[PDB]
Curated annotation (Swiss-Prot):
Changing residue 85 to V: Higher activity in the hydroxylation of highly branched fatty acids. Changing residue 262 to H/K: No significant stimulation of NADPH oxidation induced by addition of fatty acids and no hydroxylated products, but cytochrome c reductase activity levels are identical to wild-type enzyme. More negative reduction potential with dithionite. It comes from Priestia megaterium (strain ATCC 14581 / DSM 32 / CCUG 1817 / JCM 2506 / NBRC 15308 / NCIMB 9376 / NCTC 10342 / NRRL B-14308 / VKM B-512 / Ford 19). (9Z)-hexadecenoate binds at residue 49. This protein is a target of protein engineering. Its selectivity-directing and activity-enhancing mutations have been extensively studied and the designed mutations allow this enzyme to act on non-native substrates and/or in order to enhance production of synthetically desirable end-products. Changing residue 391 to W: Large decrease in the heme reduction potential in the presence and absence of substrate arachidonate. 10% reduction in efficiency to couple NADPH consumption to substrate monooxygenation. The gene is cyp102A1. This is Bifunctional cytochrome P450/NADPH--P450 reductase. Changing residue 266 to N: High substrate-free turnover rate constant. Negligible substrate-induced spin-state and substrate-induced heme reduction-potential shifts on addition of saturating concentrations of arachidonate.
């Protein structure tokens, strides 16, 4: 079979389709028209977007296909370098950093991060308890305050103090603005064109700002010698079992920047979409709220109580199904291969998994694919392989998966314990696209159940 292509614009091929501020959603719409695979060409590039479990399950075969750095990720690499996220599997720092960090990110390691997560989560509850009767909550803004603070604290024992601020830490304004530049470059048919000279100068200032503060953090920590139970000590002491070598100071910088990207962008989105789904599905919110009141019997949640929030966990899963906050990943073909019996690929050939489209595959999920029903996760083993991929695939999957689900489960649990929620504006979903997806302008009112901490 020849695969379909969306509409073209002469010599620019498909590229002007990305000239939008919601490219993932535009790509989702192309998928609905064209189906499970389409070719997408730009000057000097060709990719193929997959939306079906049928084909993505083969693309997740690690013997045929490896992680590719998409143009987006190549642009993030300018400041995230060879941290785990923007490195190639065959880079020495990939495997090395991977071997050292895996035990820091285990489900086991969560027990030790738990108390710092609680620290930030209670800040959130206390903010909301202290709001006046007239006031509402700006949802993604508060969730981002939470998740950023949480990774700051468990990452290297730094307090961004986001709940004490109206405007973001100097580091974040740079970080956010750099991610911004990295994504906007995607669209420019002619960079090096002078109209972008300010953008480039800015970027360099931003990279600089991020580097200085992180390098200073690593410096101050070594010079102090203290052994806090955070990722930075794990990295400063750790040795790769394989090579026997530790990470160098520069790579450690890259890891910290990477985790700060993750903690800002992705986990906050999950929590935002979850609360959105809950207020638009009152019977579901009530069921989650009943679980929370039953399980969270203590002034503050234990590690083990969080593991008991099963329905909360299903809610997070279903939010991730409909709106995977990291919406795509890239692969290349290790060798010449035939995809799904029909599409012959050459070595080096690129693929893109369109996760939200995958999660809409009616052959997997049934006809009610658009409905918010967390119960569809009620027995996971009934799910076909590679159907649900909000965390990526294989060895290059998200290392912070367990971190993110524990944080989210804790925070949502507490939220459902402490407040009733009201969709007071009848919010119409508007999805903002950065490196990630967020519900822009989502606001609610909370009303305290007056349960003390
Ligand atoms: C709910 C929140 C999150 C979602 C949906 C998510 C999703 C993903 C996805 C899809 C990838 C792979 C991207 C690719 O193949 O190109 C990934 C990789 C990664 N994530 Fe996450 N992530 C989340 C939170 C976090 C957290 C909290 C951390 C840790 C601070 C983190 C650290 C990473 C790292 C380091 C990688 C690269 C792993 C490697 O290649 O060795 N993420 N994540
Ligand atoms: O960055 C790319 O290479 C392509 C866009 C593209 C395709 C062909 C030609 C030029 C650009 N990326 C995409 O399809 C989508 C659309 C824009 C953003 N995007 C992404 O790749 C998402 C960026 C990251 C990837 C890893 C997990 C977190 C999110």
């Amino acid at each position: 079979k020849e695969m379909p292509q969306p509409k073209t614009f002469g010599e620019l091929k498909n590229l002007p389709l990305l000239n939008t501020d919601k490219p993932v959603q535009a790509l989702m719409k192309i998928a609905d028209e064209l189906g499970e695979i389409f070719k997408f060409e730009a000057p000097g590039r060709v990719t193929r977007y997959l939306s079906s479990q049928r084909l993505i399950k083969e693309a997740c075969d690690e013997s045929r296909f490896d992680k590719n750095l998409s143009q987006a990720l190549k642009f993030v690499r300018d400041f995230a370098g060879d941290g785990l996220f923007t490195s190639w599997t065959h880079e020495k720092n990939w495997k090395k950093a991977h071997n050292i960090l895996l035990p820091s990110f285990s489900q086991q390691a969560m027990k030790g991060y738990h108390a710092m997560m609680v620290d930030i989560a209670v800040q959130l509850v206390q903010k909301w308890e202290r709001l006046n009767a007239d006031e509402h909550i700006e949802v993604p803004e508060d969730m981002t305050r939470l998740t950023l603070d949480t990774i700051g604290l468990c990452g290297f024992n730094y307090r961004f103090n986001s709940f004490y601020r109206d405007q973001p830490h100097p580091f974040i304004t740079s970080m956010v603005r750099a991610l911004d530049e990295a994504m906007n470059k995607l669209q420019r048919a002619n960079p090096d064109d002078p109209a972008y000279d300010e953008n480039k100068r800015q970027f360099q200032e931003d990279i600089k700002v991020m580097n200085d503060l992180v390098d200073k953090i690593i410096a101050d920590r070594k010079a102090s010698g203290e052994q806090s139970d955070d990722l930075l000590t794990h990295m400063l002491n750790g040795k790769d079992p394989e090579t026997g070598e530790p990470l160098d100071d520069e790579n450690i910088r890259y890891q910290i920047i990477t985790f700060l990207i993750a903690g800002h962008e992705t986990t906050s989105g999950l929590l935002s979409f979850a609360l959105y789904f809950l207020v638009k599905n009152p019977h579901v919110l009530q069921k989650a709220a009943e679980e929370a009141a039953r399980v969270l019997v203590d002034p503050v949640p234990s590690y083990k109580q969080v593991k008991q929030l099963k329905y909360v966990g299903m809610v997070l899963n279903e939010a991730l199904r409909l709106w995977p906050t990291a919406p795509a990943f890239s692969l290349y073909a290790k060798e010449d291969t035939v995809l799904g019996g029909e599409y012959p690929l050459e070595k080096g050939d690129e693929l893109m998994v369109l996760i939200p489209q995958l999660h809409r595959d009616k052959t997997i999920w049934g006809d009610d694919v658009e409905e918010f029903r967390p119960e569809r996760f009620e027995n996971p083993s009934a799910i076909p392989q590679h159907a649900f991929k909000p965390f990526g695939n294989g060895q290059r999957a998200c290392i912070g998966q367990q971190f993110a689900l524990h944080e989210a489960t804790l925070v949502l649990g507490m939220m459902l314990k402490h407040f009733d929620f009201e969709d007071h504006t009848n919010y119409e979903l508007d999805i903002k696209e950065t490196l990630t997806l967020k519900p822009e302008g989502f606001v609610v009112k909370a009303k305290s159940k007056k349960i003390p901490l």
